Amino acid sequence: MRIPLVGKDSIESKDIGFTLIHEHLRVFSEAVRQQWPHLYNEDEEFRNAVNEVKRAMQFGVKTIVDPTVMGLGRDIRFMEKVVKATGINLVAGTGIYIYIDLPFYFLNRSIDEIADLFIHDIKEGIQGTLNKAGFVKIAADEPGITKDVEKVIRAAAIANKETKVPIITHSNAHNNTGLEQQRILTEEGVDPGKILIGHLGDTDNIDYIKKIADKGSFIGLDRYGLDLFLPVDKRNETTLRLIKDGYSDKIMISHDYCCTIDLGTAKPEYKPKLAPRWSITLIFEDTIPFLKRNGVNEEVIATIFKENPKKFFS
Amino acid sequence: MRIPLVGKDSIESKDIGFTLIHEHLRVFSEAVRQQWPHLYNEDEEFRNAVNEVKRAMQFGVKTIVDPTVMGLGRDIRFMEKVVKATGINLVAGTGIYIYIDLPFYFLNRSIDEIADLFIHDIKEGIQGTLNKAGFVKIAADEPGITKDVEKVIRAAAIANKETKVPIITHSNAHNNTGLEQQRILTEEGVDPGKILIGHLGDTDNIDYIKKIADKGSFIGLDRYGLDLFLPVDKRNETTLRLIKDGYSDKIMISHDYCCTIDLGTAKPEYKPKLAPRWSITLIFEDTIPFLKRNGVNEEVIATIFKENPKKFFS
Ligand SMILES: [Co+2]
Ligand SMILES: [Co+2]
Ligand SMILES: [Fe+2]
Ligand SMILES: [Fe+2]
């Protein structure tokens, strides 16, 4: 189907090669950064991002999909810089990120009005730019599938139909929000194969993850490093298993790393003694080497990091 | 010099002239305007802002307090273009406007680290400018007093103590959220006379109102025009009753008009019927004349619109 890149003539589905499916160059709360720019440092952030991408490309990473959308502080101009300064393939997406309600702006507005916003970022461009969204991100968490949360999921379903672009979800692995995102998206006509249920690696309940995969969707083991949601040695033990059961065709791995996080749980103070080894290369340093160590083979890891992302964007 | 102004030198608590205590030059959602700027037209917004501000001046309005803060789309620089085009005593403020929870950025952070933000705008400047904040605005609505909501309130108190600036609040006149904000600010040291429970004019329940006034806190009859919450005539009737009971010295009147409201509930087409007369000079055309006509002398009004504000910023 061909995919739009941040500041590039665009590439074809089959030519994305080794790609990381959930990585944030930078995340912040639009509101806070707009009212207190003194808290942030573009230069310090820009560099932290450059070091990651380049040294992530050194490992062979050819494409990076960044699910940073509204609520996370998407910035197409910042992302465009990183591209010019690295040459990496960035796939920017659209959508909305919320756990409970929508900004007051969305009061008594139709799901169609929302989908329009997504379709705009896909057809027209992003933030007055020519860069187009190659997907749509949606979220759900502890609060569950709330009213406004469901409205976004449906707005996503429409955008998919109208554009054919895939969907990436943030979910809570413990409250079945992921399975619900799948139920709704499927009921609305979305192709399960065009759905990636995220943050499923945050659990070791193999029986639940399989239920989502058996329905034909991708299961997102996409938080290597964040030891707060699940230790690495226990995540690897989980991924290594779904692989033994032949679920590679639905397995997607990433870090969900944020070269720069304004989160109170990501301060330049906590990380050290919370999620130490949490880099955009944690998989090459541990995961992958571990898998090969358990006799997986290059074919399988090629499936997870090349074939899957390929089927996903086509 | 003790009360900050946008694009002007500070002034004394006095010579503030006829003032509108609660008016918005324009409101919007930080997140939405960033991600989808195609939804807004600054050219138009600017013309309307300057437009209204002028007519206000034509009626003797010398000062306007704009309680637009985080969540409502505060833009100091935009306010400058309005002041320079009118030369109005526009007072800017700091604070956070939420109904339920804070942006993930505040997750973990303490009520103390939040107060530090307001103080920056009060001492240093708003969004990296010499423009100081003359007050703090907190909010609470239908959802009630949530954890995050309460955190913001207590933070507001801290700021008042070290800065001396008053607090303008937003509440729901139907769920005691206003009284709560009152029983939570005074305790933190804040001087009751330095508070202003707003949106009390949205109800005809005289008992509920008098209760807040009977505690040294200013009552906010500040939504003239917004018939959705209460018709003009029924408001005029309510304010008159309060005056006829000596609650004059504690009464503050305004429109809470959004020369450019982002809410989807105030669409361009659904204007008439919902808030036809709604403007920033609706009180000079209706309210005031009504009052005079009903035994309220010129001194009282000068008390409500001139002195009361003074006491507020002292
Ligand atoms: Co997520
Ligand atoms: Co209000
Ligand atoms: Fe993420
Ligand atoms: Fe207001």
Numbering used by the authors:
A (entry chain A), B (entry chain B): 1 to 314
Please quote the paper that reports this structure.
PLLs are natural lactonases endowed with promiscuous phosphotriesterase activity. The catalytic center contained two metal cations coordinated by four histidines, an aspartic acid and a carboxylated lysine residue. A structural analysis of SsoPox, a hyperthermostable counterpart of the PLL family from Sulfolobus solfataricus, has revealed that loop 7 is shorter in SsoPox than in PTEs; linking the active site to the loop 8, which forms a hydrophobic channel that accommodates AHLs aliphatic chain. Indeed, W263 is located at the start of loop 8, involved in the dimer interface of the enzyme and positions the lactone cycle of the substrate onto the bi-metallic catalytic center.
Compared to wild-type SsoPox, variants W263L, W263M and W263F are the most efficient at improving specific activities, ranging from 30-50 and 20-35-fold at 1 mM and 100 µM, respectively. These variants constitute the Phosphotriesterase Selected Variants group (PteSV). Variant W263F is the most proficient (kcat/KM = 1.21 (±0.26)x104 M-1s-1), followed by W263M and W263L with increased efficiencies of 23.3, 14.1 and 4.6-fold, respectively, as compared to wild-type enzyme. Noteworthy, subtle changes, such as W263L or W263I, yield to a large tradeoff in catalytic activities. Regarding the PteSV group, while these variants exhibit higher phosphotriesterase activity, they demonstrate mild improvements for the oxo-lactones and no or wild-type-like AHLase activity (W263L-M and W263F, respectively). Indeed, all variants exhibit a lower Tm compared to the wild-type enzyme (between 92.0 ± 2.1 °C for SsoPox-W263L to 84.1 ± 1.6 °C for SsoPox-W263V). Consequently, substitutions of W263 affect the relative orientation of both monomers; for each mutant, the monomers are closer to each other compared to the wild-type enzyme (with the exception of W263L). The analysis of the normalized B-factors of the variants clearly reveal that the substitution W263 is destabilizing (as confirmed by the Tm of the variants), but also that the active site loops of PteSV are significantly more disordered than those of LacSV. PteSV lose their activity before the loss of the global structure (Tm), whereas LacSV do not, and exhibit a similar thermophilicity profile to that of the wild-type enzyme. These data strongly suggest that the increased disorder in loop 8 caused by the PteSV substitutions collapses the loop as the temperature increase, whereas it does not occur with the LacSV.
